Amino acid sequence: TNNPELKFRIPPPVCLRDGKKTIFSNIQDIAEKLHRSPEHLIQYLFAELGTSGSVDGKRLVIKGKFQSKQMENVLRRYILEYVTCKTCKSINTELKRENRLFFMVCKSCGSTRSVSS
Amino acid sequence: TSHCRFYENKYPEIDDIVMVNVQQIAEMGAYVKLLEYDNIEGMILLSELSRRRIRSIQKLIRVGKNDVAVVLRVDKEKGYIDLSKRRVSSEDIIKCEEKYQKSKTVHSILRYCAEKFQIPLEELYKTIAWPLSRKFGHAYEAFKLSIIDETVWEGIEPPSKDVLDELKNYISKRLTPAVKIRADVEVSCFSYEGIDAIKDALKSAEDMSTEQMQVKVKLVAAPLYVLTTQALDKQKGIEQLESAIEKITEVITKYGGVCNITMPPKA
């Protein structure tokens, strides 16, 4: 009764390679289709990838030569440990804070997990 | 007017260390002004300029800014200085820059006093600054003592006692810090009465807090008690905190417990 509906909604990753430059123009669409703020996604991108980039307008520009293979792999790993809840197969969970550590919490069930490192 | 030497004479001495500002590099190197001594020019030609191979000419010279320097030869007829920058060891450069920092700091205060009283800065350096540097090795340490002890000025002949008064004022306003002495006491009691023992211990400890030096035993953890005080002479806090140690040991050697010292008093 409560959940008659009971993700296959990951955007097709468009890696836009301008020679020595890389553009991820769809980053806003992924960030909104996984219910994660783009700031944290970009931080995780610059944590797994050891570079720096600029945000324009929604779009991320990083002057470097990189494949869509590794972008897809890092997106899948982020979804595995951030977007997807480990105890239950759900996407409703979001990033929040409980003293100073980052404590992402669930909304579909309400669990208490942490993924920060 | 900003001028005058920082050290005794006007000419730099042989085999000493200075720190100079660069303004201009023509062909053979940079003949530059000195900020440790006076304001005359002294040259570094390209052979004694870069320890590494001579690749970057302007990057390592950075016209307009300061850098460590070492004087080789002095021409005591006209004011010509031969000087280098390669020949200062990694150990040396830090003491070089420390001496420059001290000399620069002592300059501005007497600059203020000279501007206010319209006295030449040379006169102020001759009267008060140089005898202080003779007495104490350096004048900034003399002013630090002047904050603590008024006697360091006794033996100097001011151009006017008004200079002394306004210099007291500006040194107290400008040079003011009173280093914090902290320590750590380990309470290792397995005894019966320990809370009341700690209450009496801090009562005794804080009863010794003077007007100018106040001791408080803050709680950060149960076994580890952190002792904090501000010593202005940096020579009373150790004894007061050893007094606190004596108090705590006397209190707890009779309640039944054991207490030990982890970190003694220190700046």
Binding site: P12, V14, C15, L16, K21, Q67 | -
Partner: protein, 95 residues
């Protein structure tokens, strides 16, 4: 400005996923497969293929596992083809 070339009955568009050694490449064909392609003649050491650039590759009737590159699109005929829609438009590749 040389004219582009369209596909014919067994020759299909693809994208170099990453180029292989010793004169081979791996081409993600725009059919759903990560096929292996050989850099043909007429094209070996005159028109250099860069990783991440839309190309034309000939299938072989008797091997569907491996195919051979034929023509290369210098990202201009490629963008025009994407505009016309000769390839599945989810995999957009552009500078």
């Amino acid at each position: 400005k040389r004219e582009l070339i369209y596909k014919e009955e067994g020759q299909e568009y693809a994208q170099i996923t990453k180029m292989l050694g010793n004169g081979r490449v791996e081409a993600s064909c725009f059919d759903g497969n990560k096929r292996m392609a050989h850099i043909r003649g007429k094209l070996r050491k005159k028109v250099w293929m860069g990783q991440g650039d839309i190309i034309l590759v000939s299938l072989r009737d008797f091997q569907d596992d491996q195919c051979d590159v034929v023509h290369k699109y210098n990202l201009d005929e490629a963008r025009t083809l994407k505009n016309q829609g000769e390839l599945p438009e989810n995999a957009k590749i552009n500078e």
